[PDB]
Amino acid sequence: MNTVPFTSAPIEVTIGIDQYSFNVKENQPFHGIKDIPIGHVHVIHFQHADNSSMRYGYWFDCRMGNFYIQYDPKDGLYKMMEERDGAKFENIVHNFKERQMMVSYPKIDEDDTWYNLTEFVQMDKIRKIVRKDENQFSYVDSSMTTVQENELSDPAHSLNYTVINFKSREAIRPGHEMEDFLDKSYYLNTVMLQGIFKNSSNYFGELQFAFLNAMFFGNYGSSLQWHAMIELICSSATVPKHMLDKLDEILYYQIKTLPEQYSDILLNERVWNICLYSSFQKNSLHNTEKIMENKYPELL
Amino acid sequence: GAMNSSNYAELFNNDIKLFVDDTNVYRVTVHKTFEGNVATKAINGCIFTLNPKTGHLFLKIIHTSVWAGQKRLSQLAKWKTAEEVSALVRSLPKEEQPKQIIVTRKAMLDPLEVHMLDFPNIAIRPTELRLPFSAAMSIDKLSDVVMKATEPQMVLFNIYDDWLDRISSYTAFSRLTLLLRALKTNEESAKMILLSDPTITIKSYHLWPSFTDEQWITIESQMRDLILTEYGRKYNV
Ligand SMILES: COC(=O)c1n[nH]c(C)c1Br
Numbered sequence A: 001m002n003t004v005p006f007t008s009a010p011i012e013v014t015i016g017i018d019q020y021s022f023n024v025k026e027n028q029p030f031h032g033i034k035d036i037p038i039g040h041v042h043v044i045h046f047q048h049a050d051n052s053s054m055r056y057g058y059w060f061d062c063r064m065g066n067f068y069i070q071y072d073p074k075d076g077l078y079k080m081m082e083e084r085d086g087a088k089f090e091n092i093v094h095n096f097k098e099r100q101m102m103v104s105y106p107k108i109d110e111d112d113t114w115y116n117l118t119e120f121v122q123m124d125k126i127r128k129i130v131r132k133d134e135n136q137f138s139y140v141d142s143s144m145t146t147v148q149e150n151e152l153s154d155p156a157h158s159l160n161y162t163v164i165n166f167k168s169r170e171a172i173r174p175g176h177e178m179e180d181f182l183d184k185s186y187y188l189n190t191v192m193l194q195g196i197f198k199n200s201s202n203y204f205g206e207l208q209f210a211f212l213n214a215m216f217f218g219n220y221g222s223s224l225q226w227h228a229m230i231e232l233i234c235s236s237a238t239v240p241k242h243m244l245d246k247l248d249e250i251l252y253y254q255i256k257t258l259p260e261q262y263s264d265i266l267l268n269e270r271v272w273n274i275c276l277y278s279s280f281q282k283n284s285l286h287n288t289e290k291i292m293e294n295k296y297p298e299l300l
Numbered sequence B: 001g002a003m004n005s006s007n008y009a010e011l012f013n014n015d016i017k018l019f020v021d022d023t024n025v026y027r028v029t030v031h032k033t034f035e036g037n038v039a040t041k042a043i044n045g046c047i048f049t050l051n052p053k054t055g056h057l058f059l060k061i062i063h064t065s066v067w068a069g070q071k072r073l074s075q076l077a078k079w080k081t082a083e084e085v086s087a088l089v090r091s092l093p094k095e096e097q098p099k100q101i102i103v104t105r106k107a108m109l110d111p112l113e114v115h116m117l118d119f120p121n122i123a124i125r126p127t128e129l130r131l132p133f134s135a136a137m138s139i140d141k142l143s144d145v146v147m148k149a150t151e152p153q154m155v156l157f158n159i160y161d162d163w164l165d166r167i168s169s170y171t172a173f174s175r176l177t178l179l180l181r182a183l184k185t186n187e188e189s190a191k192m193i194l195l196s197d198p199t200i201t202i203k204s205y206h207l208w209p210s211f212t213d214e215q216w217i218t219i220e221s222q223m224r225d226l227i228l229t230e231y232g233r234k235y236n237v
Helices: A086-098 A113-118 A123-129 A177-182 A185-197 A200-217 A220-234 A241-257 A260-266 A269-278 A286-295 B008-012 B073-091 B106-115 B133-138 B140-148 B169-185 B187-195 B213-235
Strands: A002-005 A013-017 A020-024 A032-036 A042-048 A056-060 A067-072 A077-082 A138-141 B017-021 B027-032 B038-043 B045-050 B056-062 B100-103 B123-125 B153-158
Touching (some): A002 A067, A013 A032, A042 A077, A056 A077, A113 A200, A123 A138, A177 B073, A177 B106, A185 A200, A185 A220, A200 A220, A200 A241, B008 B169, B045 B073, B045 B133, B073 B106, B100 B106, B133 B140, B133 B169, B133 B187, B140 B153, B169 B213
Parallel strands (some): B100 B123
Antiparallel strands (some): A013 A042, A042 A056, A067 A077, B017 B045
């Protein structure tokens, strides 16, 4: 079980660690989070009390280094840092633990939510969407735009999601215009899966990462990407059964975890009504359809 | 953006543009079958592609053979329209290609945009106007060429006849839409107005009678009156 040490908490802040969150008061004695499950990516995120603007956070995998959080009073944010002195790290951590100055990652043993939400998410693919190669961890916030978004302004700070555009030459074979537009299986299976993502696990990993950035940071381009990748599968007549069954599970746990008071801005009515009720896969998302109807029937 | 009454004069500027109407592409008669069920039988159709500045009409005749063995024909018809419009644009020299295509029905936007991906510099636009181009098949010479076709075919017309030698494109388009609105609202009456006098002739190379200037004023007044009335005869006013 790993730890994220915090130097201190000089400003009052709501801290998230995966789907959990807690409040820390200004200059509260607080030195981080312990008992973090190894074997998953994680995200630690921040909402300052004074400025509910800018949610921001760091994707990380405790197997890739010793990471701690230090507040920067110049840039005005909690920064993730990697400690390369491994004995300095263990010794500080040991002292924090002895003083019981760390909150415990509060995973209930029955609870598989985080695994279910990050099943296909891998750090090496996050680091290709979020380009900052000097760090083993990846910063995301509310305002970052996507590559696709910037084609319609600072490239260094972009989310480099795979571009999906239904009215593009990439998506539409010459001489198959109607066929490829109404049935996107060509674009899903050949262009995207075989060509770009190589396999469905990589496709699902980007889909899950986009959702999580939409949910935790309100990142709008992320929400667009999540819906686009859902729509591409639902609008394909030919989808491997194993992908359809896993998509149903994936969406079910995303919809289950979404904050109920955020469904107005985070769920695209058109995409969901098409996927559940009109598309080729209207009958293939049983679990997702059932949670959607019992939790968000207004939308439908 | 969309075309409406505010930006109506844009039609007559010097940027080449085409209207595309697909109302008459897929046409059927509905009839009872031996077993007392209902069936459709397609008849020949046409794409109405019009340059409103010049009057040039590109009438692509849609022969019933194109539907044989196909499903979801109302949807297919929009894509076939888009394929033929795109083929038309491809066949033209670059300096004759439209800078904008205005579709009369919004359902044509996605089919045309997809078939025109190779022409990023051609804007596909809808309109808010309720244009009466569906009444094109009430023009006898147009209905005739469509019905007689035994194969796919493109026929070229000027829907303004020689009017532009005397009036502006703006006035010619207003005359045309008046005629077509009348034919749409009451074809029998509108045709009675045009052909009541058999003394006045249609030139072999024209669609409309050879009215003098003063007969056109009379004709247009009779067409307005018709449209005024039928709007009463319908709303009782
Ligand atoms: C380097 O500064 C630090 O504050 C630090 N270094 N390691 C750990 C665990 C911490 Br907290």
